[PDB]
């Protein structure tokens, strides 16, 4: 699958960098047991998506976008391994190869929950530290994207980017601020709290970021 392939490629480039290897195409080809031509094809596709840039010396430099994605795949891999050894107790000799697949199906919601249920997510069972925890959020998701009712917590209001200041007090009345558990629902978006019902507007809807 194209997506899964790219994710696998990005993770590979990440690993090599972490191991100290120069991410050269032939190295990635070897590690992924893919042929040079095949990887050139895939790498040539990643470039078109602004995911990687083949440096002047044929080394693959991950663009910020590609690295952000590569990181998320490492986090989903690592957490899968933590889950597999710690909870499931899968043979340590199977844990990694299995994780190589789980990283493509594990959602951020599951990841966040694993950060909860697991005793220690500092490193993977293989001693490689777990990246992207800050990015995972364990800032926040914008209400417009995160909002059926549900009770999240206000991570940020971002009143500073506001042009419309009418609902500032409407928020202050209901007592909605940073850390305020509130119940949202896209219908427009209305976030209730203190029995109060604050129906938001587009601008605030796009700037108020909440956590799960």
Q: How far is the CB of 88 from its own copies (least distance, A)?
A: 5
Q: Answer yes or no: are the C-beta atoms of 73 and 136 closer than 8 Å.
A: no
Report how far residue 107's alpha carbon sits from residue 193's, in angstroms, rounded to the nearest whole number.
Answer: 28
Report how far residue 61's alpha carbon sits from residue 63's, in angstroms, rounded to the nearest whole number.
Answer: 6
Q: Is position 127 an interface residue for its own copies (rule: CB under 8 A)? A: no
Nearer to its own copies, 99 or 204 (CB): 99
Cβ count near 27 (within 10 Å): 17
Q: Answer yes or no: are the C-beta atoms of 140 and 155 closer than 8 Å.
A: yes
- Pick one of 27, 96, 196, 206: the residue that binds Zn ion (CB under 5 A): 96
Q: Is position 116 an interface residue for its own copies (rule: CB under 8 A)? A: yes
Report how far residue 30's alpha carbon sits from residue 115's, in angstroms, rounded to the nearest whole number.
Answer: 33
Q: How far is the CB of 80 from its own copies (least distance, A)?
A: 9
Task: Give the number of residues in contact with its own copies, rule: CB under 8 A.
Answer: 23
- Pick one of 49, 92, 101, 135: the residue that binds its own copies (CB under 8 A): 101
Q: Distance of alpha carbon 124 from its chain centroid, rounded?
A: 17
Q: How far is the CB of 20 from its own copies (least distance, A)?
A: 29
Q: Which does 96 bind (CB under 5 to 8 A by kind): its own copies, Zn ion, none?
A: Zn ion
Give the footprint of Zn ion on this chain (CB under 5 A): 96
């Amino acid at each position: 699958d194209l997506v899964d392939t790219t994710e696998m490629y990005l993770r590979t480039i990440y690993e090599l960098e972490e191991e100290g290897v120069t991410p050269l195409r032939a190295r990635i080809a070897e590690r992924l047991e893919q042929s040079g031509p095949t990887v050139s094809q895939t790498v040539a596709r990643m470039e078109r998506d602004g995911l990687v840039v083949v440096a002047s010396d044929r080394s693959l430099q991950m663009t910020p976008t590609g690295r952000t994605l590569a990181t998320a795949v490492m986090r989903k891999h690592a957490l899968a391994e933590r889950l597999l050894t710690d909870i499931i107790g899968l043979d340590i000799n199977k844990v990694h190869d299995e994780a190589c697949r789980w990283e493509h199906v594990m959602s951020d919601e599951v990841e966040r929950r694993l950060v909860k249920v697991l005793k220690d997510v500092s490193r993977s069972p293989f001693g490689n530290p777990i990246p992207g925890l800050d990015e995972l959020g364990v800032p926040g998701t914008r209400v417009i994207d995160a909002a059926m009712p549900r009770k999240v917590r206000i991570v940020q209001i971002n009143e500073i980017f506001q042009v419309e200041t009418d609902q500032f007090t409407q928020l202050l009345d209901a007592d909605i601020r940073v850390g305020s558990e509130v119940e949202i629902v896209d219908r427009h978006i209305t976030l209730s709290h203190n029995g109060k019902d604050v129906e938001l507007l587009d601008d605030l809807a796009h700037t108020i970021r909440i956590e799960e």
